[PDB]
């Protein structure tokens, strides 16, 4: 468990890899895989749908049970559900949907949830369907997270641009 391999280390606690989060989950067997969710735990495109599909939809049924009991999450909030076959647990975190003008400042709140967990395999919250700049998502992660976060970026082109943007931002 937690056998992460082939990451580039950006800070003492932030690692990045050009990889699909589901395939990493299957290789690594993490204690915590992070889902970039919405407040209803309705897993659409993006990481949520990729993770959900890999669980043969058990993730969405569990989420439906969670929501029926406790109601929707808040933006910036989270909940720990089961990791099924991918991880021990899945951290479901709701970043701001900047497409709907939700407060980008809640991206910081979202990443805070990471600090409740020694080690996580995570994507870049709000960076796809929710419309945030991926560079900005990385900046907020490295600035907010103090635990060990292994970031999976599947698109090689985004990953190269993200590394070169981080080198610039760290050196100023």
Q: In terms of C-beta density within 10 A (0-12 exposed, 13-18 middle, 19 or more buried), how is residue 97 classed?
A: middle
Q: Whole-number minimum distance, CB 7 to ligand OI3, in Å?
A: 14
Residue 93 or residue 171: which is nearer to ligand OI3 going by CB?
93
Cα–Cα distance measured from residue 142 to residue 161, given in angstroms and rounded to the nearest whole number:
16
Q: Whole-number minimum distance, CB 137 to ligand OI3, in Å?
A: 7
Residue 68 or residue 172: which is nearer to ligand OI3 going by CB?
68
Residue 119 or residue 124: which is nearer to ligand OI3 going by CB?
124
> Dihedral of the CA atoms 4, 17, 10, 108 (nearest 10)?
-100
Q: Whole-number minimum distance, CB 92 to ligand OI3, in Å?
A: 9
Residue 4 or residue 154: which is nearer to ligand OI3 going by CB?
154
Give residue numbers after which the chain breaks (C–N above 2.5 Å).
Answer: none
Q: Whole-number minimum distance, CB 25 to ligand OI3, in Å?
A: 9
Handedness of CA 96, 79, 119, 5 (dihedral sign): negative
Cα–Cα distance measured from residue 139 to residue 94, given in angstroms and rounded to the nearest whole number:
17
Q: Are 25 and 32 in contact (CB under 8 A)?
A: no
Q: In terms of C-beta density within 10 A (0-12 exposed, 13-18 middle, 19 or more buried), how is residue 90 classed?
A: buried
Binding site for ligand OI3 (CB under 6 A): 20-22, 36-38, 43-50, 95, 123-130, 134, 152, 154
Q: Whole-number minimum distance, CB 93 to ligand OI3, in Å?
A: 8
Residue 52 or residue 119: which is nearer to ligand OI3 going by CB?
52
Cα–Cα distance measured from residue 92 to residue 55, given in angstroms and rounded to the nearest whole number:
15
């Amino acid at each position: 468990v937690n056998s992460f391999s082939g990451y580039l280390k950006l800070t003492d606690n932030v690692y990045i890899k050009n990889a699909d989060i589901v395939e990493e989950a299957k290789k690594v067997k993490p204690t915590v895989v992070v889902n970039a969710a919405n407040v209803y735990l309705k897993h659409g495109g993006g990481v949520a749908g990729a993770l959900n599909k890999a669980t043969n939809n058990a993730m969405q049924v569990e989420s439906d049970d969670y929501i029926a009991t406790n109601g929707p999450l808040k933006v910036g909030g989270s909940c720990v559900l089961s990791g099924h076959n991918l991880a021990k647990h899945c951290l479901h975190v709701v970043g701001p949907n900047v497409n709907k003008g939700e407060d980008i400042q809640l991206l910081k709140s979202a990443y805070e949830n990471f600090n409740q967990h020694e080690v996580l395999l995570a994507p870049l919250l709000s960076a796809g369907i929710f419309g945030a700049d991926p560079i900005h998502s990385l900046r907020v992660c490295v600035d907010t997270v103090r635990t060990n976060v292994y970031l999976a970026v599947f698109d090689k082109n985004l990953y190269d641009k993200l590394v070169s943007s981080f080198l610039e931002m760290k050196s100023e």
